[PDB]
RNA sequence: UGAGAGUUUGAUCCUGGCUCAGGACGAACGCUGGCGGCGUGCCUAAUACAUGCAAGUCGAACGCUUCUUGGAAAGAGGAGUGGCGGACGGGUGAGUAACACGUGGGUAACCUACCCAUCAGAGGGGGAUAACACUUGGAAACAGGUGCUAAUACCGCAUAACAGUUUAUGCCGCAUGGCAUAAGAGUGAAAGGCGCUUUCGGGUGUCGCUGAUGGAUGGACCCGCGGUGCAUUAGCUAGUUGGUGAGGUAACGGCUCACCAAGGCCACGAUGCAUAGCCGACCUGAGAGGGUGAUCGGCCACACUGGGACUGAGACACGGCCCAGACUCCUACGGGAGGCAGCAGUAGGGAAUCUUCGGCAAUGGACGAAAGUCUGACCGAGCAACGCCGCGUGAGUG
RNA sequence: AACCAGAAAGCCACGGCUAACUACGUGCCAGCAGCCGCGGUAAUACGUAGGUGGCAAGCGUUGUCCGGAUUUAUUGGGCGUAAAGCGAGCGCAGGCGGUUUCUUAAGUCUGAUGUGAAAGCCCCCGGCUCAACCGGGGAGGGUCAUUGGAAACUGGGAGAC
């Protein structure tokens, strides 16, 4: 149930997010296994941060990100390259 | 309290009444096929095949795990010769 | 197979029981405070199936698996056999 | 990155004790008071708890019932079978001197639902039941009986050995053995749903269904080392220690049994008694060290007190079941119900610690094909100079 | 954009340690103090007044932990008379060891790899009008595990004096 998602981390109204892959049961701050990136919702346009090597391994490995991850790695060309370079083999 | 779980209790309930059903008839099973060997007669080997049966049935359909089934054809198979 | 145990060398303490020995490793330390060698000791228990070795002698073992309630060590040679 | 002073004497030097000047706090109380910015708030009784919420979901698995527009479909409800999740997420520190924890290693003794990948399948049959209709017993909680009905519910028949074991052949290793390929053997499985092509088409897309193997995540067991007071606490142990055999477990093993032999640990502190949950860290210090483990993260353990197990991949289960016990409540006396150490609030204790608030807009979770529903997790709002940071209660001449 | 100096300062202390002094009042009574100690008729020590000093939306008192404490002395103390050599021997266990050749490499130094979660303390950079705070990036911590070297010192082996 290994699932990439968001992390708060901002203080009392100013947020943040660093996207870290993470198990599904732990809770929202709690543990994980790793972070990739990072990603500022506030200031527009958002700026963001990835590895691009990371992702393209724990999806491969098998991992479901959530919807925003996935707004969010879409506008990187990453599940461009993914579904480019899989459903070709 | 007992809010949504008291459908939780009928089904266990109704579930571990068949479960303790069949692996009744498998233990059944196996110990008719044990007293045969002791009584030295014929009739040595169709009860052993149906002894095999039932262990493989109790194993798939039903549930043990699945080691305890290769574990006691072992330790049958190793009994019938 | 890719890798090792904890091969400890040491002599033996006592062998009465079948199949098993008592051997000894023994090392130094240095005390937390002051720097001051001490030295303390343990006592392992190993199997030999066939009573090899004899009291007063040095060996060498190697950590195996739970092989009883306290005896999980296996010998491998008399080193240096005594008398 | 290293500062000292006062006090024994008629006055002196030395040894020597007591006291003071510095920091910090989950702080309390006494006088005093405008704010903004970010934080924190039962350490005592793991005491007893009125009140409201804190876990459901799926009509695209299946048959029913009530409606709003004698046949009509749509929309609206309601109960039930069936599936997944209630083992996560939140709480507290009572127990615990040990592999519980920190750290480094081992499993040639191991399990792993959903997720991803590959291969092989998905044939053919059968008997039931809740609902519902009638009906019996009960204050109640709820228990029966009679008759009919569906399924991806259930049961047997098939075919599948890629799993295991036995043999043979070869490769290798930390004894036990591991790996490949060939054989010889007894044996096990399953479900359809929404759609497209609809010339009977019978072919398909997609979510499900079953066997096998990898990946990933998670769980279990073993071991070295390290963290506390007493020796006005010296011996402790009879499943104990070892063996043969059997039984058992995801899995090795006195884990448990029958037999055999008398072992095992201790001055390098066993046994006993007493206090404490452990760690990342915080406080102080020139430094070595000393003292604390509240907010935040990780682990372990507990759910009124003590036992037991079922369903399940996963519990001996925080709002699950059964038994015993103390307490509170209702009876028609025959019998039933209950557990805020979830979020708020109440009484009690104490020197001392708040609102019975708004909302799923974000992030995260559960179910669902999707809209969506649930979410006291959470985000925010409210109170208290409790902490830290910033700024005023004016300025020029006079 | 408008209007108003207008609504907005208390607390502790002043004999020495310690920064900051004089009147009036009481007269070993009232009372005060962390320690020295003040109070029996001209009190900088008690009480008020007026001055002064320290902090300031805070200020004081209590309680607790470390400091100063070299007062548990590893860094870092001592035993004639100040507290302190057992009344003296024999001695198992233990602690420590003459000199030299070769050897080994446990202790020792050194190299590579893994590993020491995140948030903290620290360094650089950055964002809120600055500051707390928030953000990115780096170091530190092992007595750890594996593996390669050196051979003076201590230890283990064969020797010679």
Same mark, same amino acid.
Not at chain 2, 46 to 66: F, P, Q, R, S, W
Not at chain 3, 21 to 45: L, Q
């Given at each position: 149930?290994?699932?990439?998602?968001?992390?708060?981390?901002?203080?009392?109204?100013?947020?943040?997010?660093?996207?870290?892959?993470?198990?599904?049961?732990?809770?929202?701050?709690?543990?994980?296994?790793?972070?990739?990136?990072?990603?500022?919702?506030?200031?527009?346009?958002?700026?963001?941060?990835?590895?691009? %090597?990371? *992702?393209?391994?724990? +999806? =491969? $490995?098998?991992?479901?990100?959530? %919807?925003? *991850?996935?707004?969010? +790695? =879409? $506008?990187?060309?990453?599940?461009?390259?993914?579904?480019?370079?899989?459903?070709? $083999? | 309290?007992?809010?949504?779980?008291?459908?939780?209790?009928?089904?266990?309930?109704?579930?571990?009444?068949?479960?303790?059903?069949?692996?009744?008839?498998?233990?059944?099973?196996?110990?008719?096929?044990?007293?045969?060997?002791?009584?030295?007669?014929?009739?040595?080997?169709?009860?052993?095949?149906?002894?095999?049966?039932?262990?493989?049935?109790?194993?798939?359909?039903?549930?043990?795990?699945?080691?305890?089934?290769?574990?006691?054809?072992?330790?049958?198979?190793?009994?019938?010769? | 197979?890719?890798?090792?145990?904890?091969?400890?060398?040491?002599?033996?303490?006592?062998?009465?029981?079948?199949?098993?020995?008592?051997?000894?490793?023994?090392?130094?330390?240095?005390?937390?405070?002051?720097?001051?060698?001490?030295?303390?000791?343990?006592?392992?228990?190993?199997?030999?199936?066939?009573?090899?070795?004899?009291?007063?002698?040095?060996?060498?073992?190697?950590?195996?698996?739970?092989?009883?309630?306290?005896?999980?060590?296996?010998?491998?040679?008399?080193?240096?056999?005594?008398?």
């Amino acid at each position: 149930a290994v699932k990439i998602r968001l992390k708060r981390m901002g203080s009392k109204k100013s947020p943040f997010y660093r996207i870290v892959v993470a198990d599904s049961r732990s809770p929202r701050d709690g543990r994980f296994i790793e972070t990739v990136g990072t990603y500022n919702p506030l200031k527009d346009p958002a700026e963001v941060v990835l590895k691009e %090597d990371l *992702v393209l391994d724990w +999806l =491969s $490995k098998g991992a479901q990100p959530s %919807d925003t *991850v996935r707004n969010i +790695l =879409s $506008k990187e060309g990453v599940m461009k390259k993914h579904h480019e370079a899989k459903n070709v $083999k | 309290n007992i809010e949504s779980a008291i459908k939780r209790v009928r089904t266990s309930a109704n579930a571990n009444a068949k479960n303790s059903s069949q692996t009744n008839a498998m233990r059944t099973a196996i110990k008719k096929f044990e007293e045969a060997v002791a009584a030295g007669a014929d009739n040595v080997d169709a009860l052993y095949n149906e002894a095999v049966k039932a262990v493989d049935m109790a194993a798939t359909k039903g549930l043990i795990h699945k080691n305890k089934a290769n574990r006691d054809k072992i330790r049958l198979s190793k009994l019938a010769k | 197979e890719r890798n090792q145990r904890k091969v400890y060398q040491g002599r033996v303490v006592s062998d009465k029981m079948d199949k098993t020995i008592t051997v000894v490793v023994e090392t130094k330390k240095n005390h937390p405070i002051y720097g001051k060698r001490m030295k303390y000791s343990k006592k392992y228990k190993a199997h030999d199936e066939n009573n090899t070795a004899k009291v007063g002698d040095i060996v060498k073992i190697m950590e195996t698996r739970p092989l009883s309630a306290t005896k999980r060590f296996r010998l491998l040679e008399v080193v240096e056999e005594a008398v």
